[PDB]
Amino acid sequence: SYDYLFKVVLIGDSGVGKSNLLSRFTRNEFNLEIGVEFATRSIQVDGKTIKAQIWDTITSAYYRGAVGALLVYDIAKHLTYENVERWLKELRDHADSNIVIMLVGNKSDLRHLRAVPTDEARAFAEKNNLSFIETSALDSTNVEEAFKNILTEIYRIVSQ
Amino acid sequence: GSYDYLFKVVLIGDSGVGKSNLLSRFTRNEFNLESKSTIGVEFATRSIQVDGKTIKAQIWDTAGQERYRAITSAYYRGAVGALLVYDIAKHLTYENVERWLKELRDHADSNIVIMLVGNKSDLRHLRAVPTDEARAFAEKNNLSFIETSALDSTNVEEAFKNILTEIYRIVSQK
Amino acid sequence: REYHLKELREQLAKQTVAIAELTEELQSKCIQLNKLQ
Amino acid sequence: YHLKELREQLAKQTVAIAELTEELQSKCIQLNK
Ligand SMILES: Nc1nc2c(ncn2[C@@H]2O[C@H](COP(=O)(O)OP(=O)(O)O)[C@@H](O)[C@H]2O)c(=O)[nH]1
Ligand SMILES: Nc1nc2c(ncn2[C@@H]2O[C@H](COP(=O)(O)OP(=O)(O)O)[C@@H](O)[C@H]2O)c(=O)[nH]1
């Protein structure tokens, strides 16, 4: 089985693709359509087996033990990005101080309908010590790269 | 604080024998005089000391099984100990012990530690199941045996500490 | 009305399965840890 | 009626899952030594 087990939570406004980011990473599925659930996926990092349980959508229990967080917005819906500030505060208030956070701009496949400039998003991320990457759960772009990125940053940290 | 071992122990038997109260008496020192509220079945924890090692017990009530029948396997999964509970003043609950035992054989590990428990010893003036007969049954089926009273809090601590110790002694001899 | 109750139980059931799987793994971890230090 | 009890129980179980995860996560880190 696994060597490590990391809890990673997905936060962000409804409809940004959190559920689809989870389904594509854990079972390579995308759809077009509650309570609290999670799914697991194992990857290799430094010869070690890292099992990630990714959580989607009690607020204190949700963040409890979370070592990673993907703050997700919609690059075609600027409203979802304006609310990133609110989600970040919920993280800072209800989670660990050493949690690894990545700002994820989903639906990169809608570049022609982009409402959030990537330079502006990265500027926000860099100032707030957040990782940043644009993804597309639809056509599977940077999804593996996103999760593998955050799971590696977490791993290197706990390797102390 | 933390612990040195986590052991899962399940409570098994007919409804009304006192499973919920054995659990509440051991984990919280609380007792309910009335009939328990049946919902999504639950569990509770308590830490005791065995040979210096802190042993945390995750104790389950398995009543709602066969109402959440699809997940019956979840109740028995990882269970290293089992309390087979009956009512000493209700012989019917004692007959059904052989039934719950076959249930245990199928759903649980072949080498799970089983203790036969006669609860409501405080109702000894209405004893329907003689101790000698019950103890002999436990001997015939290789079961540990104790009589308890969740109400009077008699042998409750001992019952759990016995099975947890026995479990620990087994995994430590590995 | 009735659909909420049935939907809840399914969620309750699935979380219970999750708990049992975690506990079993946690049991095994503690045992093999005590076999060391 | 008895649906509010189910909501609280789902909440309690999530907390339990979180605690279990946390401890597993901690134990694994200790195991690599
Ligand atoms: N074009 C595009 N649509 C997406 C992407 N990810 C999710 N969606 C769509 O967004 C809608 C809602 O996404 P959902 O999974 O419910 O996000 P959540 O509510 O935040 O968890 C779905 O109909 C998806 O088809 C993506 O990468 N590209
Ligand atoms: N006199 C007496 N009554 C008990 C004892 N343990 C439980 N009861 C009562 O038996 C009834 C049913 O017990 P319960 O805990 O619900 O059994 P369960 O359905 O198997 O979990 C309750 O009214 C309890 O108060 C005991 O040790 N002595």
Question: Cα A155–A159–B2 angle (5° rounding)?
Answer: 95
Which one, of A33, A55, A103, A100, lies nearest residue A75 by Cα? A103
- Contact at CB, C34 and B74, closer than 8 angstroms: no
C-beta of A107 in contact with ligand 1 (< 6 A): yes
Residues of chain A found within 8 Å of residue C11, distances taken between Cβ atoms: 35, 37
**Who's near D9: CB < 8 A, 6+ residues apart?**
B39, B40, B42, C12
Q: What is the C-alpha separation between B170 and B54, in angstroms, rounded?
A: 16
Question: What CA–CA distance (Å, rounded) separates B68 from A72?
Answer: 36
CB B174 within 8 A of CB C35: yes
Residue B113 and residue B82 in contact, taking contact as beta carbons nearer than 8 Å: yes
**CA–CA dist B15, B63 (Å, integer):** 7
B12-29 burial string, b = 16+ CB within 10 Å, else e? bbbeebbbbbbbbbbbee
Gap between the Cα atoms of A123 and B103, Å rounded: 61
Where does B23-143 show beta strands of DSSP type E? Answer: 43-50, 53-61, 79-87, 113-119
Q: Which residue of D has its CA nearest to A61?
A: D15
Q: Nearest-5° angle of CA B157, CA B162, CA B168?
A: 125
Q: How far apart are CA B167 and CA B65, in angstroms?
A: 24
CA distances to A72, A123, B163 from A133, in Å? 10, 12, 53
Q: Please state the residue numbers annotated as binding site of B for GTP.
A: 15-16, 18-21, 32-33, 35, 37-38, 64, 119-120, 122, 150-151
Helix (H, G, I), strand (E, B) or coil at A40: strand
The dihedral over CA atoms of B25, B30, B34, B39, expressed in degrees to the nearest 10, equals: -80
CB-facing half-sphere around the CA of B103: CA atoms within 13 A: 21
D8: nearest CA partner in chain C: C12
Taking CA atoms, A41 is separated from A36, B95, C1, C24, in Å, by 17, 47, 36, 19
Q: In terms of DSSP bridges, do strands A68-74 and A48-56 run parallel, antiparallel, or are they unpaired? A: unpaired
Q: Give backbone dihedrals phi and psi of A127, rounded to 5 degrees, phi first.
A: -70, -35
C-alpha closest to that of A69 among A95, A45, A36, A35: A95
C-alpha to C-alpha distance for B148 and B87, rounded to whole angstroms? 10
User: How much distance in Å is there from the Cα of A18 to the middle of ligand 1?
Assistant: 7
| Resolution of this structure in Å | 2.7
Of the listed ligands, the closest to the CA of A76 is 1
Euclidean distance between the first and the last CA atom of chain D, given in angstroms as a whole number = 52
Q: Strands, E, within chain A: which ranges?
A: 4-11, 37-45, 48-56, 68-74, 100-106, 131-134
Amino acid identity of residue A28, one-letter, is N
What letter would DSSP give residue A66? -
Alpha carbon nearest to ligand 2 atom 8, residue: B18
C-beta atoms of D14 and C16 within 8 A: no
What ligand 1 atom has the least distance to the C-alpha of A139? 27
Whether B37 sits inside 8 A of D5 (CB atoms) is yes
In this structure, are residues A145 and A156 in contact, taking their beta carbons and an 8 Å threshold?
no
CB contact under 8 A, A65 and D19: yes
CA–CA dist D11, C12 (Å, integer): 10
Neighbours of B130 (CB within 10 A): 13
Q: How far apart are CA B32 and CA B18, in angstroms?
A: 10
**Residue B19 identity (one-letter amino acid):** K
Structural Rg of chain A based on CA atoms:
15
- Calpha distance B61→A123 (Å, rounded): 53
Span from the CA of B91 to the centroid of ligand 2 (angstroms): 15
A35 to C11: CB separation less than 8 angstroms, yes or no: yes
Domain positions in chain D: 1-33
Which experiment gave this structure? X-ray
Helix (H, G, I), strand (E, B) or coil at A102: strand
Residue B146, H or E segment: strand B144-147
Token readout for B151 is 């109400």
Which domains occur in chain B, in start order? 4-174 (3.40.50.300)
d(CA C12, CA C6): 10
Task: Give, for ligand 1, the residue of A9, A18, A20 to mutate: max count of ligand atoms closer than 8 Å to Cβ.
Answer: A20
Residues 6+ apart with CB under 8 A from B86: B13, B14, B17, B93, B94, B96, B97, B116, B117, B118, B119, B129, B134
Q: How far is CA B169 from CA B113, B119, B162, in A?
A: 11, 26, 11
Q: How many other C-beta atoms lie within 10 A of the C-beta of residue B38?
A: 12
Q: How far apart are the first and last CA of chain C?
A: 54
- On chain C, the residues whose CB falls within 8 A of the CB of A1 are 25
Residues 6+ apart with CB under 8 A from A116: A73, A74, A75, A76, A78, A81, A105
**Chain centroid offset of residue A51 CA:** 16
Tokens of A109: 């496949």
- Closest chain D residue to C19 measured between Cα atoms? D17
Q: Which has the closest alpha carbon to C30: B140, D13, B99, B58?
A: B58
Query: From edge to edge, which strands make up the β-sheet containing A48-56?
Result: A37-45, A48-56, A4-11, A68-74, A100-106, A131-134
Residue from B12, B17, B21 to probe ligand 2 pocket by mutation (most atoms less than 8 Å from CB): B21
Q: Please tell me the distance from the alpha carbon of residue A134 to that of residue B27, in angstroms, as a whole number.
A: 49
User: Residue C33 and residue D27: Cβ atoms within 8 Å?
Assistant: yes
For residue A127, which of A157, A90, A88 has the smallest C-alpha distance? A88
Cα B9 versus chain centre, distance? 7
Considering every ligand atom, which ligand is closest to the CA of B32? Answer: 2
The answer, yes or no, to whether any atom of ligand 1 lies below 6 A from the CB of A18, is yes
Smallest CA-to-CA distance from B86 within B43, B44, B133 is with B133
Residue linked to tokens 């957040």: A130
User: CA of D16: how far to CAs of A147, B10, B65, in Å?
Assistant: 25, 17, 20
Whether A65 lines ligand 1, by a CB cut-off of 6 Å, is no
The single-letter code of the amino acid at B145 is F
- For residue C34 the two structure tokens come to 């005590």
User: What amino acid occupies position C19?
Assistant: I
Q: Is the dihedral of CA B161, D19, C18, C13 positive or negative?
A: positive
Alpha helix segments (H runs only) across A13-116: 18-27, 59-63, 78-82, 84-94
